[model samples]
Target: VYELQVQKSVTVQEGLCVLVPCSFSYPWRSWYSSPPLYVYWFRDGEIPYYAEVVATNNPDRRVKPETQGRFRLLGDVQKKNCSLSIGDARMEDTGSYFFRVERGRDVKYSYQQNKLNLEVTALIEKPDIHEPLESGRPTRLSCSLPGSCEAGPPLTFSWTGNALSPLDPETTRSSELTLTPRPEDHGTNLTCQMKRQTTERTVQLNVS
Candidate 1:
């Protein structure tokens, strides 16, 4: 008899990362050491023979080009671990996927009893700042709202302040930023206004 254990549904925002945990077991086979076990994950509504697998433990097997680098097999077949990781999320990647396992010639099973469902939505989350900015050094400032899975909506922001930068308050940007905090910049109040909203978010910093 063959059985599988895995989460049925997983949701993520576009541009984020997702890790799916999976495990399985089956009847006796030739041997666990030789031939090496091959585990395959195929997208729902597609044939494994005709459709490219999204992820697999077999190196020679071809995966979808769009998902090649992004999808990874994180589990050990012998241990019955079938965990998969998504390096980057895409809207088109939303769908159900099936898992199949093969060992020796006697064991070949695809667990269709329960499949993994991935739901991708538009990203609408606030950016979290990297904490504890040291003084006088050019520090790389970045954040990942994609990887974070919190129940919330994305927000709009505009940068404005003197202690953090002497540039015009007209600056508005997203993504990565490198911040160099001067010792004198300690205790400076930086404010970012919400787009269209006059109210601003104030963050007081300490460089000690």
Candidate 2:
């Protein structure tokens, strides 16, 4: 008995990432020789051999150049786990895909019925900026991406300004920066840049 389990449809925001959890089951009697199991993911079109390969565990198989570093297969096939992950998404990445498994000869199957559908939508969500006006005292300014609080992926928070000496802005996961503003730096513009989808917010410093 051969069976596959996976989400048939998933939606991802542009420039964002998502993981597609999957699992499969096969005959128990066939693993006596412990033959290696090969797994593959292909974009839905034509056939497996001619279709655009997304990701695979086989080192000999080649994936598309555009999706080389972005698409990934998580966990081991021997454990019957076939989770797929999309690191960064674009409008062109939206499509349907399928999974396949090839055991030692005579046993090759593609799960076409459970094809995964990827929906990439516009990233209209903006970042939330909280600024404090404290003169001569250290203040922390935080920039948070909408709700994803997915702890997220492909999103970088940056606070840029000549007057603001925000520490650790280059860190991909850091969102808040602590700094002291002076009366001389009043009216300086502070911009919070979300590098994922190019969303930015600016505020004029009023160090009262």
Candidate 3:
């Protein structure tokens, strides 16, 4: 008997990458007597038997040649880890994925009850903008994405409709815009745009 532990669901944007946190366990007897265990990842299909094998760490070249570099196995079977990494995610990649284990000859098992559901979205969603407008008062506005920018590519931010203080700084994970609001700025529209590769999102702030 064996067990697979992995994230229940993950949401990622197109062209980005996602890491599936995973771990597993099996009978101690199998570990002591069987050859080194191998971990495999499969994407669910119309039927269990027809599941598509996405990745594996067999190291023996026994199964079909690993499928290029899009899917990667980043865990150690000896350590009971089966994490997977998917790069350049696309809408077609969204589905349920399962983990399978194999050791020696004729010893194969698949954990289908527990699977990871991947949701590939086109937009990264607008960044969270914290805006405070007060006349003649120095205020700081911050914009951040829901996911870590460092996990994939650096994020770029652009501001429109307002002059930010020279002290504003930009970082891969978030952006900051500092300024002192004026009475004349009331009713003006301010927009913050966050971009990563081909994906972009914008949020607006109507100064009041």
Candidate 4:
């Protein structure tokens, strides 16, 4: 019996990347004798006829132009693998995908029993904290986003702990958190949080 094995479901954040693991097996008696195998990945629809081909190893005309660079085939058919990668995932990418195989005489046969469901959601990565811990000295703690904050949304910063000096709004993306450390403040914990809409990320400050 022909078989396909793949991740049943995968969850990834929007604007991130995801890899779908896949493997398959066919009757050995006919496998080597048949022509080269063609592997394909398609996003399923409500009906079988509505499925859209998303990615494939073949460079033939069957590859959809719209999915040119977004979906990539990361597996080798000679090794009985059909893994795929989706880059810069979007919320609209949430759906069930299936794998299909085509041999010499067989055309577009799919293993419907084994399908992969992908879920995409907004992602909020942890903030970065840059600070120098020294007793009896004034220090500047800076909290920033890992990448371009302009790509997402406006960020608002908030601090929890001792009183902090206010930062200028011009540098809101990489706002400064000023603090003066004292011997009595040793082992005190300070948390800095960044918020954008409903997504929030936080970082801890270690005082010594």
Per-model C-alpha RMSD: 6.9, 4.6, 6.0, 6.7
Off by over 4 Å in 1: 30-33, 131-208
lDDT of 4 by residue, 1-208 (tens): 6888887989877655677777887654554476777777877743334544687765563655556566787867879888888765668879988887876764557788888889987776666676367665567777665532243345677766542333243333346755556555544455567665433444444556
Per-residue lDDT tens digits for candidate 1, residues 113-172, read 888999998666544555557766776554334363321234355665667453323443
Say which candidate scores most in TM-score: 2
Candidate 2 residues 92-195, lDDT tens each?
88999888988777668898788888999888767776745777787776787653534224567766786754444344246877677767788888788887
Q: Model 1, 69: alpha-carbon shift in Å?
A: 1.7
The local distance difference test score of model 4 is 0.65
- Per-candidate TM-score against the hidden true structure: 0.68, 0.75, 0.57, 0.58
Q: What is the lDDT of residue 206 in candidate 1?
A: 76
Ranking by TM-score: 2, 1, 4, 3
Residue 191, model 2: Cα distance from true site in angstroms: 2.3
> In model 4, which regions exceed 4 Å deviation?
28-34, 46-52, 127-208
- The TM-score measured for candidate 1 stands at 0.68
Error of 4 at 204 (Å): 9.0
lDDT string for model 3 (37-70, tens) is 7777776643334444677776543332333465
Clashing pairs in 3: none
